[model samples]
Target: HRRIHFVGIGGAGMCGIAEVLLNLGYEVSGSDLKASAVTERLEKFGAQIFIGHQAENADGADVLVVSSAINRANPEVASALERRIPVVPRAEMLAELMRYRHGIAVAGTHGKTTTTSLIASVFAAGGLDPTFVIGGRLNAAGTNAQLGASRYLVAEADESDASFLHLQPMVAVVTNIDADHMATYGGDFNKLKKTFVEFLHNLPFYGLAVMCVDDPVVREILPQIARPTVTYGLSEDADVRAINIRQEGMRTWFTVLRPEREPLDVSVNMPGLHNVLNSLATIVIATDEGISDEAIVQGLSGFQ
Candidate 1:
């Protein structure tokens, strides 16, 4: 087994990959700046953990997976480089893990974690049992990652570092491309928009791109995308839209209109219009994949 070492392992993004690797039966080891409940959880589950960064921590690791916050000057990363161990970005590793699976990648300036978890829940309810690596804890699974028996893998695509470009998922969701992470694009908003368009092009010819047209930036870029695309939002022209939306405290009920299907009344426990867009994305993916209406209904309604 190739032993993988994680640098800055306790982060919300890195830990999920480590946990999934462990579940896949890899010999996983990691070092973080400090101990967290995340590292402790990994330790309890058979991964070797170090409390501080040290060159010696890279000993015996076949490969190193470093978080974006970590730099080459870090002792462990330097040691791994000097020792000829392949060092990779966290997203690259995530892309490799997703390679063989039917991946559903959620990308946007906001709501990536929630949208990713929502897709996982809906897939699970549909009996797809998808493996997932989320940026935050999925309350339903009580963890950030899990290895499922099915071939589906649901994950968040990190556009903050432009690392999401490494992923070639079967389906890609762009919730909205806002002005955040402009630093990665040299502070040029147009460059940021262009990068999102490039990310959409990463999909295969037959792959699907699910977009939210409610955001002006996304709508502006729609015509530029050449792949098979599905648009979702409250916008009248969206291919998948929600109408007659009602919100009761933390709950939301809306009727979804798809291309040729009957209007389906569905409700999610999440509040706000943003979440409805998120759920609508899930519905588009699930419906295209032939998931039953009952599963979509139960998944959204039963979401925690």
Candidate 2:
């Protein structure tokens, strides 16, 4: 539990988790095909970075963290397994981090990063001081993953490798289920659709499923989801819908209509209806968590 090693630590997704653990004072060690700025940066932060993979690199590690791009037969991975050391996927480590927190997982073929970032910023602006694990660096925070003080944890759930199933978030959002990762579903579209349904089912019975209903596929699963849900989109039937969407240059403004709440006008810096949808998703989560309207407006307005 003290030392964690990564087989391919330089990956975009793998590196963030490693960075967070490193800041948390874990003995983080990882290997890549070659050295890069990422390895150098992690080294500056006290991580043991290896330039190349080797069986001996797995030494002095409590567990090995592997990414989807990593092979189980990798020399270091094989060595770790043979030594009876625990090996876990990147998402499993993320799940462990969320296990005791108010976890919010944003998932979809697209918009996962943007939506997750919005939630993180909005949560932070509200003074929640959330811990977030996103795909890219938050220019505002200068890091993708942060170990915040609050119990709120917001992260992007990866659907490409089907590794997101490891997460069990209290509030789960599916921006849309487009089924782009056909290989992960054995080339069957139904399997991909079913996997999303299964991901939604991962929510506890009392947990909320925030979904985009504009996507036909998402609407199709409406009846299948037996859990409590909140649907958001431009559609008239959406439980939390956005209307009066107007864009001026790079700013988009919209007024949201929700049940038991006053219609609120909001604006996002990103110009596009897609960005509006991402903001709407954040609004749903923020509103549900009782985030003050001032914080929501502040976060969306200052988003760069």
Candidate 3:
């Protein structure tokens, strides 16, 4: 078994992947500068947790994974380099995990986690045991990551470092694109937009691109995406859209309209129009994957 060592395993992005890898039965080991609930959780799952960064901490590691926060100067990373261990970025490792599965990567400046979670829930409800690695907790699963028996792998594609370009999912969703993380794009708004387009193009020619037409930026770049694209949102012309949205406290009710399919009157526990859009994105994927409407409704209603 390969021992994969993480330099900073307590991060929101790192822990989920670590946990999923652990559940997949990999020899996962990691070190954080300080202990956290995340580290404790990983420890409980059989990952060897180191308390600090040291050269020896990476001992026996066949692969060293580090997030963008950690640089080559870190002692463990340096040791891994000296030992010729493959030092890779978190997203690269995630890409490797998705390489063989039917990956569904959620991107955009916002809503990646929520949308990914919704997709996972809907798939679970449809009786598909999809492996998921979300950036936030999926309350139903009580964890950010899971190793499921099915071929589906749901995850978030981080655009902060343009690392999302490394992910080539079968179904890619860009909820919305905005000005956040422009530093990585050299502060050029057009560059940011072009990068998102690039990420969409990362999909295979036959892969589906699920985009939200509500965001002006996403709309502006819609014409640039050459792959098979399906759009969703509140817009009238969206391929998959929601209407008659009604929010009662924490619950939201909306009717989804997909091309030639009967309208789905669904309700999610999440509130606000943004969540309606999230649910719409999930519906588009579920509908395309042939998940029954009954399962879709049950999944959205059960999401916590």
Candidate 4:
């Protein structure tokens, strides 16, 4: 494909996608309202940068990629329409890419970014070299996003207005559901719950649903889906539960259970029980990807 131009390229999600495209050897360029660390870094990677929007910026692009923040009324957007250039939204593009590989989507009101980053770290540490896109910078990967050769592709799946329905993930992790995005779900808890239930139901037959047993909202939706499900939490009944949790200085350690295999030891540099859960969630997905224990240990250790 020719150069891909991103509109609103400075946003975290947009920048992460841009970084992945850059790593994959795509000629990436874009326009942002103002220069930021993200856009500056993209410029260093040889992407053509435009400080502001212009109809001319869309001139030679093979495809115009836009984030949720881009306005259809913008001059550049109007130009792309006039030229009949293909314009792809961020989530739509992500869904298209997921179709060709084993996609692992981390979805929830919170912890999606952190959980996705943790999974990426485990895969990277194990030398799986999976492509990853998340909403925050992963210190281990040295970027918010990366492109690798493995069949695995990890992403942070957004659920607002049931947007995640666009994704066809091979495995999905729902950390928890809360009432944060009330504006999209009509300010109703039941409506939000219904949307998440649909997200679980949308997974493929072989798709695995890794759920947080600790969250009541997520727990309630588990029975409605037919896909094979795995639960992760500190509770003893959870399929991939944690035990003997302890913290040393800045590091936290816990043991994760799996059927047949020995209990796996996990250590994350980040503090809080939430980070431990994030680490365990990553382990569950990584292990399902057939990653070795050595890689998991090394990856979690590097997080510190």
Candidate 5:
């Protein structure tokens, strides 16, 4: 068995990857700057956790995985390179993991994490045991990533520094890009827009792009891309539009329009218009992944 070592494994993304690797039966060991609950849990799962970075910690490892936070000057990182150990970034590792399954890349400045989690729930409801690596904790899944038996991979595609470009997704979703990650994009919205357009154009010919048509910025860039686009929003013209939105207590119910099929009546446990839009995005991507309307309805209703 190949031994995998992670530097800075306490982070949400890093821990999620490590957890998935552990579940996949890889001999996983890692070190972080500090011990977190995530690190504590990984230790319980048999991951050898080092409290701090040190050259000795890199011993006996075939490969070293480093997160973006790991500096080049770190003794462990430098020693690993000096020893000619293969070091891969967290995003690159994630892309490699996606290659083992039907990859779904969820992209957007905001809501990518939430949408990815919701889509994972839909897959779970449909009895598809998909592996997922999301950006945040999902109350539904009880974790940020899942290691499942099905041939489906769900992940959040971050646009910062155009990192999402590295992924070749079978299905991609753009929740609606906005001005964020200014440091990575040099604080230029136009540049960010261009990057998003490039993301859509990079999709395979048979690949599907699920977008939110309600956002003007997203709408403006949609036409410039050359892939199969599936739009979702409150607009009547959207391919998966939502209507009859009603909120009761903490829950919201809406009707989702699916092309050439009967509208899906779904209710989400979360409230707010943004959550409604999130539900629409989830339904569009889930349906494209072959999830049934019944499963989508159940999945949304169960989301917290």
Candidate 6:
């Protein structure tokens, strides 16, 4: 097992990958600016956690993983670079994790984490047992990531810096697109939207691009996507549309109508119109993969 060191491992992005690596039996070590519950949890799971950056912390690491918060001048990072140890960005590492599996990369301006987690749950509920690396914990699973005994790998593809371009998933979901990470596209809104187009283009010819027609930005690029695509949203023109949506407290119930299939009654235990779109995307992908409706029902009900 290689020693993988994560800089700023207490973060939502880093902790999940660290946890998944731990479940994979890797020798995981990480450092953060300060101690945190996330770091403590990683330590309890057998990761060596350090509270501050130091040269010695990188002593035995085969590779160092970092988010944008990590400084190249940080002593630990400098040490790793000086010693010829590989220093990789988090998204690059995520891409590698997706390389050999049935990668499902979910990208969105806001709901990527929730959508990715939902798909993971839906798949697991169906007994597909997909490996998932999410940006946030799936409260039901009690972990953000897991090493499952199946070929499926579901992950929240980060677009904050457009690093999601590195991932060539077999299935890609764009819940919605907006102008949040424009710097990576040189401060051009069109550049950002075009980059999303490029991301969808990374899909194989037969690969599926599950998108949302509800967002004007996402809808604008629909005509540009050349791969097999499925659009889901409340829009009537969408290939999969949700109808009669009603929310009671934190949970929302709705009926999903898909092309050539019976309208399925489903409810996601999440409150809002945004999650309703997310759930619709999940259902579209799962159904595309032939996941059972019973599993879909059980999955959405289990989401908290």
Show model 6 residue runs off by greater than 4 Å.
1-3, 7-15, 22-60, 67-75, 129-150, 246-251
* Model 2 bad stretches (over 4 Å): 8-15, 22-57, 67-75, 136-150
- lDDT (CA) for every model shown? 0.85, 0.82, 0.84, 0.79, 0.80, 0.83
Cα lDDT tens digits, model 1, 1-304, are: 3799999889856777787778677899999888989889888877899989889999999999987744767999899889889898777787777776788888898988888878888888987778776653222253344543467888788777546688879999999988878888899999999999999998999999999999999999999999999999999999999999998778999999999899999999988898999999999999988999999999889999
Clashes of each: 0, 0, 0, 0, 0, 0
What CA RMSD would you report for each candidate? 3.4, 3.4, 3.5, 3.8, 3.5, 3.8
Clashing pairs in 6: none
Encode model 2's per-residue lDDT on 27-52: one tens digit a residue: 99999998888888878878899878
Q: What is the TM-score of each candidate against the true structure?
A: 0.83, 0.82, 0.82, 0.79, 0.83, 0.79
On residues 33-115, what C-alpha lDDT tens digit does candidate 5 reach at each position? 88888888888887999988889988888888887745677788888888888887777777767665687888888888778
Q: Could you tell me the lDDT of residue 148 within candidate 4?
A: 34
Q: In candidate 6, where is summed lDDT lowest over 10 consecutive residues? A: 136-145
Q: Please provide, for model 3 over 222-277, each residue's C-alpha lDDT reduced to its tens digit, 9 standing for 90 to 100.
A: 99999999999899999998988887778999899999998879999977889899
Lowest-sum lDDT 10-residue window in model 5: 136-145
Instruction: List candidate 1 stretches off by more than 4 Å.
Output: 8-15, 23-27, 31-60, 68-76, 136-150, 247-249
Q: In terms of TM-score, how similar is model 5 to the real structure?
A: 0.83
Clashing pairs in 1: none
Which residue pairs in candidate 4 collide?
Answer: none
Give the clash count for model 6.
Answer: 0
